[PDB]
């Protein structure tokens, strides 16, 4: 069933019940039924109701072995994220899916303000929340964005819940086109991952999937797991994005870059 569609069954009193799951995020997964109830303002047994009506639309999953309580699905918070930017006045209406995997669902979506969009509504110390984290995700990427305005990412519009709203950009994977100036292109990405860590910027995922190309150039996407230089690790993450996308080149192209100088390069500019 899409977005849309799912959109299209919530009345007002469902919102507000979504709205007090989320406003609760930050200390239960289980959001209990007498705060959901409380912070809505609707009494119990018709909060349990409706509740269970965005449940069946698996927008809530809703537990009962310690207590009643309910968080939101992965759609379920990415509706919720995407009313958010509704009400904003910064989208008018989803469109159809671009692509989603492991990380994200990105949909192509229209803004009377910023034109043809696309907004990417995020999924995913002990090493062993499913909200709060796709929620920090979402945010994460949508700072460093704005940390990068100016240089060859997309311009960002907004961010909500899970959700990012930002330019669309005409342009396909890497992966999936053959250059024929790979020594030139391989040193474009370099250089743009020299500009980024001026400006105190790690990517931290770069590779032939986020680096977007066409005739007029290339664009970085995906910053979800960016992280600031002097963050534990920074270095050695970026380090990991210069040896990933010079490795793919050799690969693909037997282009002959050095890693170690390459690194050694942007480092010290
Ligand atoms: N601003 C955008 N403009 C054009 N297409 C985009 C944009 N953002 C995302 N996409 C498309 O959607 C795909 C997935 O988005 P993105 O890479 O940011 O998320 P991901 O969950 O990290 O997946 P990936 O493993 O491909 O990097 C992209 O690789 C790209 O083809």
């Not at 009494?43 to 309580?69: M, P, T």
């Amino acid at each position: 069933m899409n977005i849309a569609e799912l959109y299209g069954k919530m009345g007002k009193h469902s919102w507000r019940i979504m709205d007090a799951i989320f406003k609760n995020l930050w200390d239960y997964e289980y959001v209990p039924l007498q705060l959901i109830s409380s912070h809505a303002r609707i009494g119990e047994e018709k909060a349990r109701n409706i509740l269970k009506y965005l449940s069946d639309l698996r927008v809530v999953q809703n537990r009962q072995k310690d207590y009643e309580g309910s968080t939101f699905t992965f759609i379920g918070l990415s509706l919720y994220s995407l009313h958010r930017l509704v009400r904003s006045g910064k989208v008018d209406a989803i469109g159809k899916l671009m692509g989603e995997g492991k990380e994200s669902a990105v949909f192509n979506c229209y803004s009377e303000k910023f034109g043809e969009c696309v907004v990417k509504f995020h999924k995913v110390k002990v090493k062993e929340h499913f909200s709060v984290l796709a929620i920090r995700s979402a945010r994460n990427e949508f700072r460093a964005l704005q940390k990068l305005q100016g240089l060859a990412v997309p311009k960002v519009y907004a961010w909500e819940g899970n959700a990012v709203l930002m330019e669309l950009i005409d342009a396909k994977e890497l992966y999936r086109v053959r250059v024929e100036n790979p020594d030139e292109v391989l040193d474009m990405i370099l250089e743009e991952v020299a500009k980024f860590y001026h400006r105190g910027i790690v990517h931290g995922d770069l590779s032939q999937y986020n680096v977007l190309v066409s005739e007029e150039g290339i664009w970085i996407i995906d910053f979800p797991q960016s992280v600031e230089v002097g963050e534990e690790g920074w270095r050695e993450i970026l380090e990991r994005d210069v040896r990933n996308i010079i490795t793919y080149f050799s690969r693909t192209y037997r282009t002959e870059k050095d890693i170690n100088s390459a690194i050694d390069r942007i480092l010290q500019e």
